[PDB]
Amino acid sequence: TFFKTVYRRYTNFAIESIQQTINGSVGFGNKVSTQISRNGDLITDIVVEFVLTKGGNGGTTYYPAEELLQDVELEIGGQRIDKHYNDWFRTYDALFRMNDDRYNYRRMTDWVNNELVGAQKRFYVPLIFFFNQTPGLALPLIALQYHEVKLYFTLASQVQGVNYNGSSAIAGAAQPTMSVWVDYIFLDTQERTRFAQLPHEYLIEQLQFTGSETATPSATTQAAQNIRLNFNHPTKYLAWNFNNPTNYGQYTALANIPGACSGAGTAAATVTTPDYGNTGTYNEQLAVLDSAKIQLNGQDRFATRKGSYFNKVQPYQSIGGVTPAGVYLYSFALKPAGRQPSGTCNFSRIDNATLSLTYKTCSIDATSPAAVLGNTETVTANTATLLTALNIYAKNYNVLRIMSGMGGLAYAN
Amino acid sequence: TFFKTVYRRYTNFAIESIQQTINGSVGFGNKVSTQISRNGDLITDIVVEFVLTKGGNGGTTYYPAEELLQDVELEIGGQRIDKHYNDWFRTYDALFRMNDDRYNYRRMTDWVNNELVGAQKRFYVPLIFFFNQTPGLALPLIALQYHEVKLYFTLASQVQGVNYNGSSAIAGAAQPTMSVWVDYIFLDTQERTRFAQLPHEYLIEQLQFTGSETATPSATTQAAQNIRLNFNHPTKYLAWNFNNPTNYGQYTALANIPGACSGAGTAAATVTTPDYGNTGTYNEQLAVLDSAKIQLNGQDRFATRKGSYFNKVQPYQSIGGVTPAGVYLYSFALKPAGRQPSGTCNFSRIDNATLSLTYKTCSIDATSPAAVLGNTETVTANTATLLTALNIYAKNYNVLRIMSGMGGLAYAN
Amino acid sequence: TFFKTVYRRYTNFAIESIQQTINGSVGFGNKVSTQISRNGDLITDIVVEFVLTKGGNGGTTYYPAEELLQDVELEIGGQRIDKHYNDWFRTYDALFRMNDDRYNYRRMTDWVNNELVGAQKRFYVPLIFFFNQTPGLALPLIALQYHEVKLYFTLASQVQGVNYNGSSAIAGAAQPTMSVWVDYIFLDTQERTRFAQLPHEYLIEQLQFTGSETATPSATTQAAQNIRLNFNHPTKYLAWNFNNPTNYGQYTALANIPGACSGAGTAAATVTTPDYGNTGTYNEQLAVLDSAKIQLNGQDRFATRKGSYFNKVQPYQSIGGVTPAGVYLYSFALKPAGRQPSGTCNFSRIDNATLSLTYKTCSIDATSPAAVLGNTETVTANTATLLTALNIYAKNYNVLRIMSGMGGLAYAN
């Protein structure tokens, strides 16, 4: 029946977001850390609060608060459970976040109101480890009595529009201010007792990353390249991008098209500098990578598909939102964004895995709007040569076993 | 298995939207009502149809059809079950509605096509009581044989862009036309019989509201204020806003910034009048409230967080969409928008509850774009002094017991 | 409990998108087909890849790749299971797709980056038959050993902005390139065995369509018209539109308003030609149809509601997104977009079904912005006379029984 719902009764509880103590000196390029205080029984969400001051004007910022959090390592009992990166967040956002939620995330990560020089704002960078994504995986502190739960952060040294303008330091730039808040759940005795005495097993996810250098060519392009993928465990999907390390989230070539370069379509237009505030694009014409395929033990896991296939279709068929050009996906799961496992590939059972790539023939004059807006599928702007860093990510499952006051991962890979 | 779904068979039924009889004289500032006719077995959605005629041009309207429905009281058997308000709808929309659905809601509530003077449109204001939100809570008329189900509406007297322009009545303004439609479900004998003989219990939600006056100060601002919260029952969350009663949904200070005031960035720019069509904003810089915390029996339910935390993070962590600046949320539930209860705080078990507030130091020259777009976290436009009304809402659960032809609420608070 | 989720273990499997062989000569106006190759055990998604070259500039294209796929027939064992159309996709998109997903779909179907003449892109048109929408209905090839699974496509002859400009062929226009890819699931022995030996039953959906000619009148308009609806089976909903066959997705009247006609609000403005790139609108003022009701065996299935009710409210109450003006919906289901049946009307049990229509009185001067942006609910632009084709669609359920190596539909209607 659709007209008489029977809601179920749950275990009584309470939530409180409690401030953490940050060990170390907060400031650009500094390594700082935190040992989660043992206030509640379980912990869920974790937010990093940053206070920054703008150094330029409209469109001079691009996810500053996000880039600021260069790395985040989650360690339990001295053991590293997972580690995220600056570029992972950007990629995660481009892939799995969407619509108003995604816009809210940008409001939390940078200036989106045309703010000017001197504007000071509060930023919120929500962590995304296994227990930060589902209360069903809430980390049980009351069960990790002899194990310390720690987070290790590394703050970027240069952040465009805050600290620097291109490669020129900005005078007067204020050192950032940081704060760490953790949400705790307080359980009622019944379940609290159960949590500290019984053994537990959690099916959690981890992030795997490998940075590589891209090829380049034009003219007789159709440059090629094979990357040996050294990943392990049952993997849900693969995500990768090609970015110019110089500019934070630049995953596509800079060009003389609106929102594609500093002062595009204008007399001041360049192609060396991006229109920071609008670094991302949906225009497939500005992304390298003509085709791609994955290979298992020397065999095609599937036939070659253009790079647009992994940017549009793979994301359409699963996680149905919209991904900016330059980010690619290949899912082994039916629902890669769902916590419930739905199809995986066990990499720790594959001797050889490879990502075979074929790039487009640059040759397009990035300074010409008519050349960029009016061209062929297999070519892109000569500016593509700057997309030198190839970042490949794999999201896998693992098992976290917690008993007798301590936890540990079932599989060490 | 993911490749062989077993759909379940349900109880046969039919839906029909049937027109209601409106008792009383329809017109601005009039109280009118309706006794639901006993056509079907259960009732779900309820829509109020309004026909209005524009009195100005582009951007002169702001959710007219919504504001028109000043109050709505749902009464059963002479007993008031719940009562919503003009400002609740605005707040509900800012918080729980999102994306295309939210845009569709605006299409149903006002002119969004740059329409001019004289444009006449059909508006649809969907009610949002417990049975209007889930067919699982469909109100069982066949079980309320001796109880009358009535709705009591109160129409606003002045609606900007329709009836008035600021405080100046608009000549020729047509009285509104109103219609009430209710969706009925017709059940097959099996279940119909079951519905009229067995006792029933419904876990429903109610709205609680308390209007208060705000503080103000600048210069040596950092004005403070504590509000005693008199709420009852297991509560899912708290939502509140500070608005200038003069302008319908103004939850933020007016300023000389695009979309922030009448003719902003222009020679005609003001700061006394809003850019009606664009009353809402995402810019945290224009909202009062620097920090806030809630207190139970003289103790901090949680540490103080800036007002941006309740506007961005609380909504990000639950109900993941995007909320305009000026609306705040503090959830006791994991999923405040879900009908299924997921965490509550029982206010009828708390002797003292308080909302402790600390405002920002206005001091900013609302007439200066460079002052508004380039400032500090703890200050806002001097225009903030107009946000004098503090509206606090609490959404709670209660039990509706229906038997022997009549219904009633389990807890009278 | 909300803090200890028990994920369920599933049947091991793998996915691979494999290219299909296209029988027949690919080219505008050609009929081509495909016999699905028997590579895997089950098949899910199916994508048609098209490579087209632009013939004009910004706003000269409107879902080209979508229109290109004029018809698609799914046949099993010589039997036609379902058949979709060009206009069904447009209507499906307007109704059930939404937000970022819907924008991604447009990226897959046409140029959205202001591309110019000569721009060549890769398009992806995802099929939407029963097994293309849910892996739970994956078509079991291993169980259809003696039945051929075939797809029959018909390519449009003229596609605005690619092949033609209005009715003028474009010289040099390249013939399209087409590719068909099917996703297969490879099952492990356990379940594979089970799939090829046990009888199966699938509750699937089909599309029903009937094209009719519209009435027209103005002045003493309020023209009327009744259409005998010849549909069959348990039907989830009805969807219909009035379009000018000349222009692909024109569901509304052309007018001298931004995005409503070629060069609107300009000296070059027309009203004979649409602003192709922006053919759709949300402005109810440009849609015909003043009111409507459905009738069963000579009786009102429900009271008459304005056309805006079926365009805004019906879609708001179910499938909550936003539908462009000109597309209408009347659902018999609680959740028409959900695969799980939730309310249906059995048309093969109704001797007479009728759609009663009443059009608006055109009379509005489509060339006048002040006339279009400032008018009454019961009138529209005189241009409405061009919306001559009435397309009515009904989505129903049926049963696909598969055993002994062959499949067939339970009900032949």
Side-chain angles (χ1 to χ4, degrees):
Chain A
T1 305
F2 288 100
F3 318 94
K4 202 71 185 72
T5 288
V6 168
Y7 294 115
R8 54 274 282 269
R9 310 192 302 286
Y10 57 96
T11 171
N12 176 47
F13 73 86
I15 318 167
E16 197 190 330
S17 181
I18 304 178
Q19 188 166 193
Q20 252 26 51
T21 295
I22 300 179
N23 182 295
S25 160
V26 179
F28 293 112
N30 290 35
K31 287 196 190 300
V32 95
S33 70
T34 295
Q35 157 163 44
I36 308 299
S37 53
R38 303 197 70 266
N39 297 278
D41 311 304
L42 316 170
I43 64 178
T44 59
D45 299 307
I46 294 184
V47 176
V48 175
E49 279 182 26
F50 281 138
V51 172
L52 305 174
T53 301
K54 234 171 170 300
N57 304 314
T60 289
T61 256
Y62 199 57
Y63 296 98
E66 173 186 282
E67 180 181 6
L68 223 203
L69 223 196
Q70 180 169 284
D71 309 307
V72 203
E73 183 171 44
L74 183 285
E75 173 205 284
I76 300 175
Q79 200 221 304
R80 134 104 133 284
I81 307 298
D82 194 16
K83 182 179 185 180
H84 289 2
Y85 305 78
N86 207 333
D87 183 72
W88 169 240
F89 279 43
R90 192 84 302 281
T91 294
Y92 175 80
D93 193 59
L95 276 171
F96 306 94
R97 203 119 50 188
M98 60 174 85
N99 306 144
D100 281 2
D101 177 55
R102 187 193 241 159
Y103 176 58
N104 195 224
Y105 171 75
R106 182 160 187 179
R107 293 179 67 203
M108 291 164 58
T109 293
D110 87 344
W111 290 274
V112 299
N113 283 291
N114 311 318
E115 353 256 52
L116 302 170
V117 172
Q120 175 194 57
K121 184 183 185 176
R122 244 283 193 308
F123 303 87
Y124 301 91
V125 185
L127 290 188
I128 46 180
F129 293 114
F130 67 91
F131 65 87
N132 305 318
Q133 306 222 82
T134 323
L137 293 172
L139 203 268
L141 287 181
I142 41 169
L144 294 173
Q145 154 160 52
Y146 324 97
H147 274 354
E148 37 107 86
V149 184
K150 299 173 69 301
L151 283 175
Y152 292 86
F153 319 77
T154 293
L155 310 181
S157 63
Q158 312 189 323
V159 186
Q160 158 65 53
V162 171
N163 228 35
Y164 281 73
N165 178 25
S167 56
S168 311
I170 297 184
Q175 68 302 292
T177 259
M178 171 177 68
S179 203
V180 175
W181 297 76
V182 176
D183 291 9
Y184 295 74
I185 299 78
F186 296 82
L187 302 171
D188 195 53
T189 280
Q190 194 69 293
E191 177 167 50
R192 221 174 72 87
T193 289
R194 168 183 170 297
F195 258 98
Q197 316 317 156
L198 312 190
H200 304 290
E201 284 188 304
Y202 292 87
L203 199 265
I204 86 307
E205 301 184 7
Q206 292 173 304
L207 185 281
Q208 279 176 281
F209 163 61
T210 303
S212 310
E213 304 183 300
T214 329
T216 33
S218 81
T220 48
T221 321
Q222 288 292 62
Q225 167 172 43
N226 293 304
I227 291 69
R228 190 62 179 284
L229 294 175
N230 195 315
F231 289 137
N232 294 300
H233 312 296
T235 300
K236 316 182 56 176
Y237 63 78
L238 296 188
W240 69 95
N241 67 232
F242 307 80
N243 89 289
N244 178 190
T246 299
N247 306 315
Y248 185 50
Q250 194 190 322
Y251 294 142
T252 195
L254 300 176
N256 193 32
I257 278 182
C261 76
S262 179
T266 247
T270 317
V271 146
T272 307
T273 304
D275 170 351
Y276 302 108
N278 301 307
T279 300
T281 324
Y282 289 103
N283 191 348
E284 176 51 41
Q285 187 83 69
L286 297 177
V288 299
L289 194 60
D290 174 41
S291 74
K293 72 172 185 174
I294 291 181
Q295 202 156 318
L296 303 188
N297 302 318
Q299 306 171 56
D300 285 20
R301 175 53 180 67
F302 60 76
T304 300
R305 326 287 270 87
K306 319 299 284 180
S308 54
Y309 161 78
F310 308 87
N311 173 245
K312 297 169 186 56
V313 187
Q314 275 292 303
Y316 171 92
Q317 306 191 312
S318 54
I319 61 182
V322 73
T323 305
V327 178
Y328 309 88
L329 183 265
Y330 186 71
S331 185
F332 295 104
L334 287 180
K335 187 159 144 281
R339 291 308 94 188
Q340 214 289 156
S342 60
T344 201
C345 175
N346 196 161
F347 276 71
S348 59
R349 272 289 81 185
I350 287 180
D351 291 297
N352 170 295
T354 292
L355 208 212
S356 182
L357 308 167
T358 300
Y359 302 91
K360 301 181 187 179
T361 299
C362 312
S363 71
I364 299 180
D365 174 28
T367 57
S368 181
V372 190
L373 299 174
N375 225 278
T376 279
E377 183 187 1
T378 52
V379 301
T380 58
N382 60 321
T383 289
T385 312
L386 278 159
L387 297 169
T388 64
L390 200 180
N391 298 302
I392 293 172
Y393 301 87
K395 203 67 155 49
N396 65 266
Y397 283 110
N398 208 305
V399 180
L400 212 190
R401 38 182 177 185
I402 288 170
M403 197 207 291
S404 305
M406 49 211 326
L409 295 185
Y411 316 88
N413 309 302
Chain B
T1 305
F2 288 100
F3 318 94
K4 202 71 185 72
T5 288
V6 168
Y7 294 115
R8 55 274 282 269
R9 310 192 302 286
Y10 57 95
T11 171
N12 176 47
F13 73 86
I15 318 167
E16 197 190 330
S17 181
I18 304 178
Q19 188 166 193
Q20 252 26 50
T21 295
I22 301 179
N23 182 295
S25 160
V26 179
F28 293 112
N30 290 35
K31 287 196 190 300
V32 95
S33 70
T34 295
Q35 157 163 44
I36 308 299
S37 53
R38 303 197 70 266
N39 297 278
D41 310 304
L42 316 170
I43 64 178
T44 59
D45 299 307
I46 294 184
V47 176
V48 175
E49 279 182 26
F50 281 138
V51 172
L52 305 174
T53 301
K54 234 171 170 300
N57 304 314
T60 289
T61 257
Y62 198 56
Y63 296 98
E66 173 186 282
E67 180 181 6
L68 223 203
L69 223 196
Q70 180 169 284
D71 309 307
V72 203
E73 183 171 44
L74 183 285
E75 173 205 284
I76 300 175
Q79 200 221 304
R80 134 104 133 284
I81 307 298
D82 194 16
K83 182 179 185 180
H84 289 2
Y85 305 78
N86 207 333
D87 183 72
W88 169 240
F89 279 43
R90 192 84 302 281
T91 294
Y92 175 80
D93 193 59
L95 276 171
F96 306 94
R97 203 119 51 188
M98 60 174 85
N99 306 144
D100 281 1
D101 177 55
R102 187 193 242 159
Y103 176 58
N104 194 223
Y105 172 75
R106 182 160 187 179
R107 293 179 67 203
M108 291 164 58
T109 293
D110 87 343
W111 290 274
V112 299
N113 283 291
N114 311 318
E115 353 256 52
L116 302 170
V117 172
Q120 175 194 57
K121 184 183 185 176
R122 244 283 193 308
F123 303 87
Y124 301 91
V125 185
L127 290 188
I128 46 180
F129 293 114
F130 67 91
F131 65 87
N132 305 318
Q133 306 222 82
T134 323
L137 293 173
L139 203 268
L141 287 181
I142 41 169
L144 294 173
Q145 154 160 52
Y146 324 97
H147 274 354
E148 37 107 86
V149 184
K150 299 173 69 301
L151 283 175
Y152 292 86
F153 319 77
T154 293
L155 310 181
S157 63
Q158 312 189 323
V159 186
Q160 158 65 54
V162 171
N163 228 35
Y164 281 72
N165 178 25
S167 56
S168 311
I170 297 185
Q175 68 302 292
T177 259
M178 171 177 68
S179 203
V180 175
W181 297 76
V182 176
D183 291 9
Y184 295 74
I185 299 78
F186 296 82
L187 302 171
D188 195 54
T189 280
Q190 194 69 294
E191 177 167 50
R192 221 174 72 87
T193 289
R194 168 183 170 297
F195 258 98
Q197 317 317 156
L198 312 190
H200 304 290
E201 284 188 304
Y202 292 87
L203 199 265
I204 86 307
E205 301 184 7
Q206 292 173 304
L207 185 281
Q208 279 176 281
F209 163 61
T210 303
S212 310
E213 304 183 300
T214 329
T216 33
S218 81
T220 48
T221 321
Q222 288 292 63
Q225 166 172 44
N226 293 304
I227 291 69
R228 190 62 179 284
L229 294 175
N230 195 315
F231 290 137
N232 294 300
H233 312 296
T235 300
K236 316 182 56 176
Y237 64 78
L238 296 188
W240 68 95
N241 67 232
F242 307 80
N243 89 289
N244 178 190
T246 299
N247 306 315
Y248 185 50
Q250 194 190 322
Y251 294 142
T252 195
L254 300 176
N256 193 32
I257 278 182
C261 76
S262 179
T266 247
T270 317
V271 146
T272 307
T273 304
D275 170 351
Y276 302 108
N278 301 307
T279 300
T281 324
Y282 289 103
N283 191 348
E284 176 51 42
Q285 187 83 69
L286 298 177
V288 299
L289 194 60
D290 174 41
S291 74
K293 72 172 185 174
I294 291 181
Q295 202 156 318
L296 303 188
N297 302 318
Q299 306 171 56
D300 285 20
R301 175 54 180 67
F302 60 75
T304 300
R305 326 287 270 87
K306 319 299 284 180
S308 54
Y309 161 78
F310 308 87
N311 173 245
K312 297 170 186 56
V313 187
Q314 274 292 304
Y316 170 92
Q317 306 191 312
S318 55
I319 61 181
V322 73
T323 305
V327 178
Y328 309 89
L329 183 265
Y330 186 71
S331 185
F332 294 104
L334 287 180
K335 187 159 144 280
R339 291 308 94 188
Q340 214 289 156
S342 60
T344 201
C345 175
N346 195 161
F347 276 71
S348 59
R349 272 289 81 185
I350 287 180
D351 291 297
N352 170 295
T354 292
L355 208 212
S356 182
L357 308 167
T358 300
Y359 302 91
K360 301 180 187 179
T361 299
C362 312
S363 71
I364 299 180
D365 174 28
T367 57
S368 181
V372 190
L373 299 174
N375 225 278
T376 279
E377 183 187 1
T378 52
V379 301
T380 58
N382 60 321
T383 289
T385 312
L386 278 159
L387 297 169
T388 64
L390 200 180
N391 298 302
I392 293 172
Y393 301 87
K395 203 67 155 49
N396 65 266
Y397 283 110
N398 208 305
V399 180
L400 212 190
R401 38 182 177 185
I402 288 170
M403 197 207 291
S404 305
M406 49 211 326
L409 295 185
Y411 316 88
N413 309 302
Chain C
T1 305
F2 288 100
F3 318 94
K4 202 71 185 72
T5 288
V6 168
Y7 294 115
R8 55 274 282 269
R9 310 192 302 286
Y10 57 96
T11 171
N12 176 47
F13 73 86
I15 318 167
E16 197 190 330
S17 181
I18 304 178
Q19 188 166 193
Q20 252 26 50
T21 295
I22 301 179
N23 182 295
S25 160
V26 179
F28 293 112
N30 290 35
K31 287 196 190 300
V32 95
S33 71
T34 295
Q35 157 163 44
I36 308 299
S37 53
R38 303 197 70 266
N39 297 278
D41 311 304
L42 315 170
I43 64 178
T44 59
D45 299 307
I46 294 184
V47 176
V48 175
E49 279 182 26
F50 281 138
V51 172
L52 305 174
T53 301
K54 234 171 170 300
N57 304 314
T60 289
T61 257
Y62 198 56
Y63 296 98
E66 173 186 282
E67 180 181 6
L68 223 203
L69 223 196
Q70 180 169 284
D71 309 307
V72 203
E73 182 171 44
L74 183 285
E75 173 205 284
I76 300 175
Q79 200 221 304
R80 134 104 133 285
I81 307 298
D82 194 16
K83 182 179 185 180
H84 289 2
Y85 304 78
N86 207 333
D87 183 72
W88 169 240
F89 279 43
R90 192 84 302 281
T91 294
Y92 175 80
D93 193 59
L95 276 171
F96 306 94
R97 203 119 51 188
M98 60 174 85
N99 306 144
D100 281 2
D101 177 55
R102 187 193 241 159
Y103 176 58
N104 194 223
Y105 172 75
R106 183 160 187 179
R107 293 179 67 203
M108 291 164 58
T109 293
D110 87 344
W111 290 274
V112 299
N113 283 291
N114 311 318
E115 353 256 52
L116 302 170
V117 172
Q120 175 194 57
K121 184 183 185 176
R122 244 283 194 308
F123 303 87
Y124 301 91
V125 185
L127 290 188
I128 46 180
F129 293 114
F130 67 91
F131 64 87
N132 305 318
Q133 306 222 82
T134 323
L137 293 173
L139 203 268
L141 287 181
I142 41 169
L144 294 173
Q145 154 160 52
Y146 324 97
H147 274 354
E148 37 107 86
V149 184
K150 299 173 69 300
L151 283 175
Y152 291 87
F153 319 77
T154 293
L155 310 181
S157 63
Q158 312 189 323
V159 186
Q160 158 65 54
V162 171
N163 228 35
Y164 281 72
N165 178 25
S167 56
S168 312
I170 297 185
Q175 68 302 292
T177 259
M178 171 177 68
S179 203
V180 175
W181 297 76
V182 176
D183 291 9
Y184 295 74
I185 299 78
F186 296 82
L187 302 171
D188 195 54
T189 280
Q190 194 69 293
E191 177 167 50
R192 221 174 72 87
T193 289
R194 168 183 170 297
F195 258 98
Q197 316 317 156
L198 312 190
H200 304 290
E201 284 188 304
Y202 292 87
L203 199 265
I204 86 307
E205 301 184 7
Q206 292 173 304
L207 185 281
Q208 279 176 281
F209 163 61
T210 303
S212 310
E213 304 183 300
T214 329
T216 33
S218 81
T220 48
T221 321
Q222 288 292 62
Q225 166 172 43
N226 293 304
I227 291 69
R228 190 62 179 284
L229 294 175
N230 195 315
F231 290 137
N232 294 300
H233 312 296
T235 300
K236 316 182 56 176
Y237 64 78
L238 296 187
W240 69 95
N241 67 232
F242 307 80
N243 89 289
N244 178 190
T246 299
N247 306 316
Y248 185 50
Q250 194 190 322
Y251 294 142
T252 195
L254 300 176
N256 192 32
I257 278 182
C261 76
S262 179
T266 247
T270 317
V271 146
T272 307
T273 304
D275 170 350
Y276 302 108
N278 301 308
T279 300
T281 324
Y282 289 103
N283 191 348
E284 176 51 41
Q285 187 83 69
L286 297 177
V288 299
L289 194 60
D290 174 41
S291 74
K293 72 172 185 174
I294 291 181
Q295 202 156 318
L296 303 188
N297 302 318
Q299 306 171 56
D300 285 20
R301 175 53 180 67
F302 60 75
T304 300
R305 326 287 271 87
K306 319 299 283 180
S308 54
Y309 161 78
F310 308 87
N311 173 245
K312 297 170 186 56
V313 187
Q314 274 292 304
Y316 171 92
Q317 306 191 312
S318 54
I319 61 182
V322 73
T323 305
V327 178
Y328 309 88
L329 183 265
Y330 186 71
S331 185
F332 295 104
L334 287 180
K335 187 159 144 280
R339 291 308 94 188
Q340 214 289 156
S342 60
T344 201
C345 175
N346 196 161
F347 276 71
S348 59
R349 272 289 81 185
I350 287 180
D351 291 297
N352 170 295
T354 292
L355 208 212
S356 182
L357 308 167
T358 300
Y359 302 91
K360 301 181 187 179
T361 299
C362 312
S363 71
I364 299 180
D365 174 28
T367 57
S368 181
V372 190
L373 299 174
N375 225 278
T376 279
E377 183 187 1
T378 52
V379 301
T380 58
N382 60 321
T383 289
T385 312
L386 278 159
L387 298 169
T388 64
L390 200 180
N391 298 302
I392 293 172
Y393 301 87
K395 203 67 155 49
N396 65 266
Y397 283 110
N398 208 305
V399 180
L400 212 190
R401 38 182 177 185
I402 288 170
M403 197 207 291
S404 305
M406 49 211 326
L409 295 185
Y411 316 88
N413 309 302

